[PDB]
């Protein structure tokens, strides 16, 4: 009898940055994220009449 | 009862009270919130078709 082949899957990884999903996001590499407690962004909106 | 802008924010992220199970023989209530993806447009509108 005989072996005719050993056929094996290869998992091609998909980076998040090279999906087109990442156009819906802004990506910043942040080194020490365990150190941060809270993030905060402040808006100031003037409204003329 | 609150403002509808808050009800829109609460509509997607908060799976509301008394949901129904899926893929199991009879209509049970689901208490495990890890998987179930159901969106029910029957609370905000308060109807039945």
């Amino acid at each position: 009898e005989a072996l005719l082949g050993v056929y094996t899957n290869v998992v091609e990884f998909v980076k998040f940055l090279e999906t087109a999903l990442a156009a819906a996001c802004v990506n910043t590499e942040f080194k020490d994220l365990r150190r941060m407690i809270d993030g905060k962004i402040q808006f100031k909106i003037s409204m003329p009449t | 009862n609150r403002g509808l802008y808050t009800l829109v924010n609460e509509y997607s992220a908060r799976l509301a009270g008394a949901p129904a199970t899926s893929t199991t023989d009879l209509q049970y209530v689901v208490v495990n919130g890890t998987d179930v993806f159901l969106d029910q447009p029957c609370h905000m509108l308060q109807e039945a078709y």
């Binding site: 802004v26 994220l33 941060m36 962004i41 | 997607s12 023989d25 009879l26």
Partner: protein, 76 residues
């Protein structure tokens, strides 16, 4: 392990989901009714000989189902 800080930049709503394409009905729209004997088993009639009679006239028990995942009804 890996930790993520994710914020929301936009003031207004920036993502919109929609119903697009119907695939299947799993409810099966069956006319089985919910049995209140199961929800409230403690409340029963005064004569325990008669309460075992009405329970006989109403009724895991299904090993299979043909048309789909069965759905309960109520009575108002």
């Amino acid at each position: 392990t890996h930790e993520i800080a994710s914020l929301h930049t936009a003031l207004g709503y920036s993502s919109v989901i929609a119903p697009a394409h119907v695939a299947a009905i799993t409810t099966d729209m069956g006319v089985h009714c919910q049995d209140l004997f199961m929800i409230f088993p403690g409340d029963a009639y005064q004569d325990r000989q008669l309460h075992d009679y009405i329970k006989m006239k109403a009724g895991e028990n299904l090993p299979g189902l043909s048309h789909g995942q069965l759905a309960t009804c109520e009575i108002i």
